């Protein structure tokens, strides 16, 4: 309860950690720790009745967030781990169920059958992109196919639980916590050309309430980099 890191502090009370490993350290690298290990709270999204889902690309959502956005442009390479806190706050009269998963290397498919999606439509800079519950048209040039029952990757949406996941059920649970190590082939990669993780939030059983209650339940995502090291002189 009431953990602190750097100059930021959140309040907690079960944590699922990666593929069984904890994030740890390894020309020559430098390791900065006093100015990157803090909780960058992304701003809150709203969960309405006919909502579909959200996704963030992970070393892209912190590209403008303070000093971590400066070390992405100054240093060429780097490798980090992450620690994700998700918590939505509803009363005892709401109902629903989320799925918080963290997909590594989530390559998405374009709407047009021949092209590839552009940069502005894969990742919103510190802003959540949205799935849809209908199809995306074929006639538009280059946009991400966001049919939520195929999860944008051409896969079954039910089988997405093989990745490290955690259920948020508003009857009994309220929050979720994930710890993800660095999963890549090369031991140190670029941070602009590549997005090695993807955090997805999908509502399976949709929100429902009576007449009178507040018609939206906000979600809060809080990310903190762990054991980061860059490469340069």
């Amino acid at each position: 309860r009431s953990i602190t890191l750097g100059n930021s502090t959140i309040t907690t009370q079960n944590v699922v950690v990666g593929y069984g490993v904890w994030p740890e350290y390894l020309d020559q690298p430098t390791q900065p720790d006093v100015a990157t290990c803090r909780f960058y709270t992304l701003e809150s999204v709203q969960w309405m009745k006919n909502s579909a889902g959200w996704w963030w690309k992970l070393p892209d959502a912190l590209s403008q967030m303070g000093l971590f956005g400066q070390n992405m442009q100054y240093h060429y390479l780097g490798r980090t781990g992450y620690t994700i806190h998700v918590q939505c706050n509803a009363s005892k009269f709401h109902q629903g169920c989320l799925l918080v998963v963290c997909v590594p290397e989530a390559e998405m498919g374009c709407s047009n059958l021949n092209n590839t999606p552009e940069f502005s439509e894969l990742s919103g800079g510190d802003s959540a992109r949205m799935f849809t519950d209908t199809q995306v048209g074929e006639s538009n040039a280059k946009k991400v196919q966001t049919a939520v029952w195929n999860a944008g990757m051409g896969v079954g949406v039910g089988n997405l639980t093989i990745f490290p996941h955690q259920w948020i059920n508003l009857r009994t649970n309220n929050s979720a916590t994930l710890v993800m190590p660095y999963i890549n082939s090369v031991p140190m990669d670029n941070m602009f050309r590549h997005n090695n993780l993807t955090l997805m939030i999908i509502p399976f059983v949709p929100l429902n309430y009576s007449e009178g209650s507040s018609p939206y339940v906000p979600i809060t995502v809080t990310i903190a980099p762990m054991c980061a090291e860059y490469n340069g002189l």
Partner: antibody
Amino acid sequence: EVKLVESGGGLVQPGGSLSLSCAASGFTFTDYYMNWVRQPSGKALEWLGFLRNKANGYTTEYSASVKGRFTISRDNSQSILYLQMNALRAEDSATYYCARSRYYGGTYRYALDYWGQGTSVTVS
Amino acid sequence: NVLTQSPPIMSASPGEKVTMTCRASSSVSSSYLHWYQQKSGASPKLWIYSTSNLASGVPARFSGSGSGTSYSLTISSVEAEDAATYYCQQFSGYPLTFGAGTKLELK
């Protein structure tokens, strides 16, 4: 009750521009998909495009023939719906409707339940 | 994908049982095919959605059926207010194509 009126039609030169407007009353406007269906003089109907509700990000999906020429948008303050037309040709003389969509189960079948009274646009 | 209705003009006396068809070029799913009814000089109205379910405020004489690529709408008893034009709609990919139209003239 669902009450949809639309206005803005009239005569316009080929190669010109014209902006329609469809007003909605009697329901929550930020919850339903809003379509646009035109129809020529006693012929088969044609579908133009719709605009999604607030829970899906207010995106648009035009048809193939009117892509780049027409533009569907809504106004943030009050409940009204627009359609911006550009580069009109001789075959765009039709009767324009303004339909609503709804969720039947929790699914979205592609039906159009409530239609407007229909405005007319001619070119010459 | 195109829809071809048949027949274009169809006449029926009051009291008989009549039917029309709506044939697609490719396979259209059974939950994405609807029927409309437009009277003379009026806005169209939704009649049957998801190929077998009645709309709100429609009489119980109408009933749709069919699957695969051939669908049909049959009227049990013809009355005096159901003389109009009927369209069928589909969706397999964008755009949403309407049918040609079957006109029902009373006898």
